[PDB]
Symmetry: D3
Subunit: 259 residues, 6 copies
């Protein structure tokens, strides 16, 4: 039967719940998981990259901050088509990975957030026309999912009519982009992915912590302050640079170790 | 004037009928054929690779064993769409290649077997969940086409009800995958491609030669023992390693000669 | 919210209107524009290449000869879909580029010609079967657009019944290929792209200047001799080699400067 | 005249003194500096790589911890030969980089290209402003000189938290007596600790560029907790030397007489093989 | 404490003694060993490549035919300098690899890491076990010393069947006498045969690592039949030397005093340039 | 015997004497010659690159302007050591290449491989036919010896029109006298011109291969108009030397005692890193 052309970009928010786990998790990612993953999807994924997170900022924990990385894929077909379940070689995936990332507690576990999007941002709300010449960006990529039972249209209205205007009013914020999550692909609980750029951490803080104190607490709030959503369950995020050396289809040459 | 998205994996079974032809055939493949091919299909083939065959095992001749390599393409469009017949630069093809591969005797000819498949295996019959951590595989890839006149459903039933249970019972066999050949693309006479993994040549032989002696000779048989098909005409195969260095779109740097 | 699978090859005719602009234009292209472009379209462009123009041949100015290069993209999706207008990082594009290329004058400016085509030539009009072994080609790529008010079918008929037979008849011409421009993509004013191969510049001249003197001047002619179309507005062209080192998705490593 | 074959490995300890500087410094390193550097030395440097530092561990500030990265080169000739001062294209090197790294304090007009009589990049790499931290650039032989613990360890043995530390004894301290202290008092503590899986050391080639450091050591643990147990708690058993410039081990002035970084076994920034220009996220 | 500039080409003759071992040995080589090796010597080896052996020709066993590959390095310094024994990460080298290649007989617990006083990889590469075949690692200059037939041959002249053979004369045989036999009796048979298109030779650098071999020759043919016609049938003309260890040419004990491989002009496994990790078939 | 460590940069001035030859010469260089060359010297050449020439400026013919490219190598050992004459595979090198480049006049049977008693490529590269132009292959140190103008210029300062010129004084002229004219009369005119942003020079290493040239200079401008203003108009102030072989600067015989090219700062043809075979346009 036919396979549908379905160009998409996806983001996975990869936490590391203890610094003691960092060397093991990073080793699995770069030594074991890159080659397994390239082996599977090289013919139908056009780009596969990791964007290591900047140091977690003050209060970043309340935003479900991914302390390892954002993992990004660009797909030509849906990876959730049931025909793609079959693989000659399955990935080497120890249970420990789920512990390191926080899906399994070693107090409450966190879901694994794997959000599919169109390849192009749907909404350009601030900073259209910004070029790389204009300077280094502190790119705060945030996904949110309204609580079960909350009308999606109500939440959309809050996000674009109450939240985004505070971003627009802050000169510290240089860029605001958004897309709806493709819920039809894999059941992801998130509803929106936004990327919100600052010059630096102080600017992120000024706007996302201090300026947002102006917002009323919504009746569905899951925490007392913005983003008003349960960390790691209904909000995940990461702050990343413009560039990553881990453009894995182009740049990987095996696990070469330091002398 | 639309072009259909038609993601496919194809396999060509490349023999070398005499050791005296090996240097010439290998030279044409790596020095001439790679650059011509990449020149033509770089924009719509996402992977192009050669898997050199392991040394022919005992009785491998009876299985249409490809003594040079399996050639693998992953396509985004059908190469058989008539619009793709037009090429700025046509491939440099000495017709001696056909002598070297055995399509032309220098003895009747053997056909050129080029089988199109979906990119993902259709049936996972044994070893689901095996990872590269489980060990090196001796991967026996075999394509079969039932003789003219044999009902294809009764061939399918023999294959899955008599042959595959013998693989399932053998501990030497670690993996069985299969896909129906896309006969609609190019007229290929083959009906199935299977891949059957062992630890080694001895395991391959214990199962595919000794255990298969329990099978009854079908009425349509073209040889006396399994696979009961005419070698190189109705069955072709190769045993290959998990890995090849000949991943041509990523790894080719021109024909560099030994000093 | 589906994206259509629309594989296409596009060509941009990049002039350099004074030699004093060459170092600046070339620097912008290779230092600034390559990384901007790759950043944008890596997940949906399978090939991106520059073919530097051979030295402008005698009377080449009358063919809208692009004195810098042909820029070539192979797309999987239409870049003119309005959803693709949104980009996180906009290309660094100084106004000076348009002066250097000749869109912005100083006497008259020239349009920016960006012609979309199918990935495979539609008409193979001479030289089918030619291989790279047959020798080095002087590849003259020319796009034409009939003037405003001229009936397109009447231009087509002139092109294929009067112009092409002269090319076909000349032993100096080794290859003729043509496609209709996909005018529905971006409104490009051109109607056809042809590629016409010679051994060298002398052969080009013999045919495209001397043999073409046999044509009657059409009633819509915008200049006295073939191509009878206004240079850079209704005709653009470049002569290029079979090979380019600038296959940018595979070969670019940053702007490494000479020692 | 001839050029001497002089194979060496060098290490530069790159700090980032405020998180607000991080995006700017990182951009300069990866977008501007890599291409300038590769352009200059491609013909005589066989490896050029960056090892980004793990998050600064508790009390890492006392060890001159580099909050950005370790920069590593493998040379075939000495970069400090005076004939190598001449370069067709000099590095684009604003004074801001020294501010971001902590070599100099923040100031007006630091977007300006560095000024020196000779090469800007070479001069920046000798920075020693009394109000900042010196620029530490240590040359070594390509092979570790002393293997003091964990010989035979393979990559199959597991992920390492590799703590690379360089030390330089203070002005007036006899080098031979610092050496003896290092190898007879310090190193036995590392050997005794089950948490330390490797100890390697080389003498700094001071003759190359006047680097004030004397030794580079690399000391491996499983993780930050192991590093802390050994390098902070276990070292409390040491007597404070008469020359100490701080109260606890390393007893040396942070960022002036000791620099360090903890890094992973692998880096994706193997720049002569892996760099493809400054591709930006979509 | 200087390191000498010592440009060299080395060849290792890699056998596979049973077809059942091939998938395991090939996996170790390509999945495990490449990255360990590149990690160790990237800064001072300018090329590292594998040339898989063509199928063993008839009577190839008598020439110590390597059934897996030739491994080739181009070195800038001697790997045998004792300072190069020290390695941050040692090679993952199970004893099994020695069984698969035929250095040692099969035995219990050969999945263990090689046990050595010094570096395991270096020890492995000196394997010289009485019940197996020695590990043959021959160092050469980068340029062939003697060009004896086919000077001026280009790649346009056609595909070569390149037979690379190393020989070492037995215990007690004068080296000058063996040299004289090689060049005055053996080589003129190659020169007369039109099936032989190329003859090249170099003296083994015996001083680097104690290699028992004395010469490396490379001898080209069009194909296996040409090889056999010359190296088997034409060589029957030679008289059997008094030192002979087998009845026919090469008159040397297979795998101990002669190793060989027939290889193609090109390899995809130019590892410093072409390796991208162990990507597995779908 | 040992090989001397001899790091050098070499330049070859590649002309194309007729536009009709351009497709053929260009094909040979990129399709045939790159792989033959990389095959030979990958282990001891650290960089191999082609810089295509900008279009020949007005009066460029009087400067021996290379209408194809500059070919650049960075060597670790001398290519002219006699031991390097031996090569397993010689370059595919038809006489026609010498026609295309202007080393020899056009003639029958020039598709023939070059015939030499030693290596054909090395012999091609010593071409010096009385009816053509010699083959100019100049060896230099890897670092410019003299920095005479524009020290400290970065790539941020803008695009360069880089005019690389080599000169050799005629038979009989005292080399010290030529040197003094170059540096006391010619260079000051470059230093004085505001259009000139950079002047670098090195002495040709004449001991390597007997190159006739004595100096290589690189002289930068903004563009072709700047080049002409300085190198044609400003140079009219110079007195004609008594050894002049043409009436105006450079006063040397085009293509025999002066060769040159104007090139950009960047080339895509960094051949050891960037070459992936001869992929043809669709
Ligand atoms: O983490 C994660 C994973 C892979 C595919 C999905 O559609 C969802 C999750 C994950 C994984 O990589 C492997 C696995 O077996 C289970 C997981 O949740
Ligand atoms: O033309 C090819 C094969 C044709 C064929 C020849 C003989 C048969 O009995 C069946 C098919 C062909 C090939 O064998 C190899 C290749 O790489 C490209 C080809 O077109
Ligand atoms: O890179 C990915 C992809 C993902 C995945 C698995 C299977 C599949 O079919 C598609 C994607 O699994 C992961 C699990 C992780 O913990 C961390 C990651 O970075 C990833
Ligand atoms: O991998 C998961 C998903 C996770 C989960 C989901 C949703 C949610 O709201 C909280 C946790 O629960 C778990 C609990 C476990 O013991 C082990 C697990 O592997 C998991
Ligand atoms: O590191 O972008 C553009 C490109 C064009 O051609 C014209 C434009 O207006 C804009
Ligand atoms: O970019 C353009 C296009 C150009 C033009 C378009 C179409 C055509 O037929 C002729 C010229 O006119 C211009 C005139 C300007 O002052 C500045 C410009 O940027 C331009
Ligand atoms: O990456 C390098 C290269 C280094 C260097 C360049 C040229 C040279 O000759 C010697 C060293 O300078 C630097 C200075 C830094 O602050 C940070 C860095 O990462 C680097
Ligand atoms: O590929 C190599 C590299 C070689 C080697 C590594 C490091 C070193 O220092 C010297 C040699 O060891 C080997 C040993 C083998 O059995 C087979 C091999 O292919 C190789
Ligand atoms: O590209 C080169 C390499 C050069 C060369 C090869 C081998 C060697 O030993 C020395 C030099 O020969 C050439 C000769 C040319 O006409 C044009 C060229 O571009 C070149
Ligand atoms: Cl923690
Ligand atoms: Cl900035
Ligand atoms: Cl709260
Ligand atoms: Cl195994
Ligand atoms: Cl039978
Ligand atoms: Cl002009
Ligand atoms: Cl030709
Ligand atoms: Cl006119
Ligand atoms: Cl681990
Ligand atoms: Cl002292
Ligand atoms: Cl203190
Ligand atoms: Cl051949
Ligand atoms: Cl015998
Ligand atoms: Cl001409
Ligand atoms: Cl002729
Ligand atoms: Cl500029
Ligand atoms: Cl004159």
């Amino acid at each position: 039967a036919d396979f549908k052309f379905e160009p998409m970009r996806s983001l996975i928010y990869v936490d590391c719940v203890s610094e003691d786990y960092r060397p093991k998790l990073q080793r699995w990612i770069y030594k074991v998981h890159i080659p397994d993953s390239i082996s599977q999807f090289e013919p139908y994924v056009t780009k596969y990259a990791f964007y290591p997170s900047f140091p977690i900022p003050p209060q970043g924990d309340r935003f479900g901050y991914a302390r390892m990385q954002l993992t990004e894929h660009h797909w030509l077909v849906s990876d959730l088509d049931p025909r793609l379940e079959i693989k000659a070689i399955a990935e080497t995936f120890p249970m420990d990975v789920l512990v390191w990332q926080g899906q399994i507690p070693a107090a409450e576990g966190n879901p694994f957030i794997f959000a599919f999007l169109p390849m192009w941002w749907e909404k350009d709300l601030k900073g259209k026309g910004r070029t790389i010449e204009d300077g280094a960006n502190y790119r705060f990529n945030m996904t949110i999912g309204f609580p079960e039972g909350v009308d999606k249209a109500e939440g959309e209205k809050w996000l674009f009519e109450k939240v985004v205007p505070i971003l627009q009013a802050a000169p510290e914020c240089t860029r605001v982009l958004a897309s709806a999550v493709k819920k039809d692909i894999n059941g992801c609980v998130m509803d929106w992915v936004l990327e919100i750029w600052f010059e630096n951490q102080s600017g992120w803080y000024k706007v996302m912590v201090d300026d947002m104190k102006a917002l009323e607490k919504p009746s569905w709030a899951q925490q007392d302050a913005f983003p008003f959503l349960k960390p790691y369950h209904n909000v995940c995020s990461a702050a990343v640079a413009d560039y990553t050396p881990s453009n894995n289809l182009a740049n990987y040459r095996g696990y070469i170790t330091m002398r």
